[PDB]
Amino acid sequence: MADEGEVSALVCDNGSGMVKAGFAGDDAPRAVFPSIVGRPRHTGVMVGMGQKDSYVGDEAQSKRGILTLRYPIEHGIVTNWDDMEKIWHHTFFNELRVAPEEHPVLLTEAPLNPKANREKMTQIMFETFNVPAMYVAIQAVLSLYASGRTTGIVLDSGDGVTHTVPIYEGYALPHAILRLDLAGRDLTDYLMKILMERGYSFTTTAEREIVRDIKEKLCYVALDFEQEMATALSSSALEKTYELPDGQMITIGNERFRCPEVLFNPNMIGMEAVGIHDTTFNSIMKCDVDIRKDLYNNIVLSGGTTMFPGIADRMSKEITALAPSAMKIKVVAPPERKYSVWIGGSILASLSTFQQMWIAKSEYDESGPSIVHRKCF
Amino acid sequence: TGQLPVRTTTSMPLEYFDSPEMELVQPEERLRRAREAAAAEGRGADSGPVGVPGFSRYFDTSGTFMWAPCVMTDYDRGQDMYHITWNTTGKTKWVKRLNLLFADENKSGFAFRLRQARRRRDESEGEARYSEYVSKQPFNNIDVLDEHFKRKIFKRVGGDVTQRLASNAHGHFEDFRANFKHAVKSAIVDVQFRQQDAAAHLAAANIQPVSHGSHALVPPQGCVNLEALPAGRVVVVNQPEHAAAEGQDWFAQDVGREGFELLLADVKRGAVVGHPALLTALQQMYKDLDISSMALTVTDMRELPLPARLGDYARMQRNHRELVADMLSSDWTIKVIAIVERILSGSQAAVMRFIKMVSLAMADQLRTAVLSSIQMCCGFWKQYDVQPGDGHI
Amino acid sequence: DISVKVVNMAMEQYLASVDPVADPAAVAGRDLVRDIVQKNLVAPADLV
Amino acid sequence: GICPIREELYAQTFDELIRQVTINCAERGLLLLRVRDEMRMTIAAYQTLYESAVAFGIRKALQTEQGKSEMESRITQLEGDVKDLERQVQEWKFKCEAIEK
Amino acid sequence: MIPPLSSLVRYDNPVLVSTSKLTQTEDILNSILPPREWTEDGQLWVQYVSSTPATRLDVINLQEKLDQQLQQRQARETGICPIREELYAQTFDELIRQVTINCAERGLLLLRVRDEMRMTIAAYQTLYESAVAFGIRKALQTEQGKSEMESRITQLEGDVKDLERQVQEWKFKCEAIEK
């Protein structure tokens, strides 16, 4: 591998609700940015020959006033593939200084990604990008590599999507993989929603990040939601006066716990669905009956939204009510839920078993985009 | 007010810069609201024609800029220009939104937009001045960028891609050479930023020092912080059949940073992907053993001309199902049995999981084959799915 | 199953067949097929 | 590869070592200072030309979407004409039916 | 066979490793600054690196040689030209030589800085080349996409004539029925 220096397949963690990047082998990524693309709205402005035709990530957000904001990936499925090609070009040469022509790549995708998606990036990475080689692994399978064992249903709930991927000895059980579509994106939406109830409107773009970071930091989770209503009505200890640099005393009271409780009570915000505990329960109930005993005993959480204290407490309590007295449940959530896929992908690339996985460009051209079928199972 | 700088016809306008994403609402929607309000309130003398009064260029009194509320008629989004009719003055002229608005609009947000627009105007003015001034300086630098390099990249792309069309698109490359020269000139200007003599010489033209920016304070480590975010919480809830004792079925554990190579070796020794030969064996078994291709009904009905009698229909499907069962149910079972007997002979928990996954893999193939056969039987009945337009004609 | 002839008996334990209880895709296919059949059972009914 | 930590740390190291070269001799210290300034200027020129290549790539990223989408609409018309061909086949069946009648 | 080309890296009269038809520091410096050699008349003549000290007078000489050679080679202080690059590299090699004679560890530190910064430069050049290649590749992908979609235009025209012929065929069938 590294007899003359190893140019390992760089990890591009197309995460649940955010994009990660970096070299395989590192204990933490190097490039992080949202999945937003900003295109110049008008043509008469760009005068000169140093023009930027796509401000990427936070550049798009910061310059949104002159840019058309389009998110090229929805729920792990790319909608504007050309935009993501601009993302890939920007990610390599503006956040890592690497050459896709010579540097191999490992690709992440949403679980149960249609193979046409893998085929089309394969054709883009080889004809439009000309990567040397490429290998693809399921996002949650990479997440489970960070669980310490080969078995586990990865209960991934990120910033924009939530997935339940039953995995038992490495290969994911595709029939019982379930996806839920409420996550930190909607948690930010509802956290804003319950803040207008506090006499302070929060919908503006600047106020959007105001609640976004507050959600990522101050959001704990009710162990018992009804108990927290009693706490809210009988005490103001929950009501914290958080301060922003502009100067304002936001009163965050019952909002401290109801927003993550939507993961178990979706209809409070108007979104019709079952709780993630219900989705977690049915997903394993869709697995092989025998292996279920360790599947609940191997529930692993992921996603960048899930540092919220008490979420695993509430997750287990909702599971405990659902689970009858014949089961065995273990909700695991180590402090890499934002980065389990990225760490797992680097772990997988560091394996010498990666040697029998390349898609050679000559072999790709010999076998077409379906080479992803022939080397990725 | 005189905050508006020297405006020139050959200067960059503000109309393109106008932000639609931090501005309150759409102007056409604003006028629809104004028309509805006029209809409801009987406006026409209080605010004149459609539109709540808003400020204008001047009070029609002085050369300097003021903010004079006026009365406006309508506006077309195509030209981004409102039509107005002063209250006491019957004059009817067309104005920009940069001055016109409604009294119902938040003046704080309007001022915010105006000031940020002024800042964008200053930024674009500086950028345009710098770009124009780059053109003046001469050069003596070489240009490595050449048709040889472009053709080399062509052939490196190769295949049907390279040799398909190589005739017309060469025009942009010559201008990209001028782009290279412009970049060289900008680099020379960045070099001349060093000494105060050159800096003071160039500062006499009211041009302000703007740098692209690459010498930023490098952060200590590019590895994203791991324990800065709150540490992970693991909650375990077994059941009375699989618990350990009474009163500790709620096992809460916290862990800090975990070893990379620790879990790497865990996967290496336990996982099939960790086992090299076992990994490729599992790959070839998952990929090569595609049994879902063969199905359980016939879509090729050219052994007998249409229409199909039910008797021969049932006969052909029954024979095809029996034959596919012969090639799959026993044949593939014996094949995978021999394969498993070979592979399992060359951690114990991981090996047991791997065997359970071999069984689960034939179960997955079973499910996929049956579901594919169900869907293609549905497609057999939908081959003449009666679309609207033909009512069984 | 594999273990049927790995240990070489007539073992009853096979791969769990497609369960109509927990295969919404199969149930939807059944509904579509039967709906199409009932739709094409109408024109022959009155044409005759 | 490329790492900013190593280059900034080595720059600090060489700046400190200017003291040692000056202790060796003052003129050596002046010469190292001047060559350091010149070589830093050259590396700045190299990074600027790299940024110019970046600008080239970013500009080329969005030089084609106009026509690409404009007649991906044409491709939409193409499958529309394919549906028209299906209608032609249907009407051919209807007419051959009357032929047989 | 290889005449000794002009070079401000000061050298000695070429030494003999082919004849004719002290401390670890000298070994370190000789290894790190390799001798330039030519097989003149079938016997290799290796030009050894200089090893005598430099004084204030020698520094004056090297500085003056730098200043004159920059002029008669017509280098450019501004911008980038290989003439100035190689002249400054040669002067830095003499600096390496003299600081190795002074303090070997100091020379080793200069060598490490020299290695890391030239590998940085090589990485910059290769990355520039890769970025240009990627852009040209995207241009080619666009061009062949245009070709394929113009072929789609042609297929539309073919489908149109097919529609026309099928309409004519229906007209013929109707006329035959009437007949």
Swiss-Prot record, chain A:
This protein's GO CC annotations: inner dynein arm
SMART domains: ACTIN
Predominant cellular place of this UniProt entry's protein: cytoplasm
Broad enzyme group: hydrolase
Cell compartment(s), UniProt: Cytoplasm, Cytoskeleton
UniProt similarity note: Belongs to the actin family.
EC number: 3.6.4.-
Protein name as catalogued: Actin
InterPro entries the record matches: Actin, Actin/actin-like_CS, Actin_CS, ATPase_NBD
Catalysed transformations (reactions): ATP + H2O = ADP + phosphate + H(+)
Keywords annotated in UniProt: ATP-binding, Cytoplasm, Cytoskeleton, Hydrolase, Nucleotide-binding
Highest taxon of source: Eukaryota
MF (Gene Ontology): ATP binding; hydrolase activity
Pfam annotation, one family: Actin
Function summary: Actins are highly conserved proteins that are involved in various types of cell motility and are ubiquitously expressed in all eukaryotic cells. Essential component of cell cytoskeleton; plays an important role in cytoplasmic streaming, cell shape determination, cell division, organelle movement and extension growth.
Curated annotation (Swiss-Prot), chain E:
Example of a GO biological process term: inner dynein arm assembly
GO-annotated cellular components: inner dynein arm; motile cilium
UniProt subcellular location: Cytoplasm, Cytoskeleton, Flagellum axoneme
Source organism, top-level taxon: Eukaryota
This protein's UniProt keywords: Cell projection, Cilium, Cilium biogenesis/degradation, Coiled coil, Cytoplasm, Cytoskeleton, Dynein, Flagellum, Motor protein
One Gene Ontology molecular-function label: dynein heavy chain binding
Function noted in UniProt: Plays a dynamic role in flagellar motility. May be necessary for stable assembly of a subset of inner dynein arms or for the binding of these arms to the outer doublet microtubules of the axoneme.
Family membership noted in the UniProt record: Belongs to the inner dynein arm light chain family.
The name this protein goes by in its record: 28 kDa inner dynein arm light chain, axonemal
Part of the intact protein present: 1 to 203 of 253
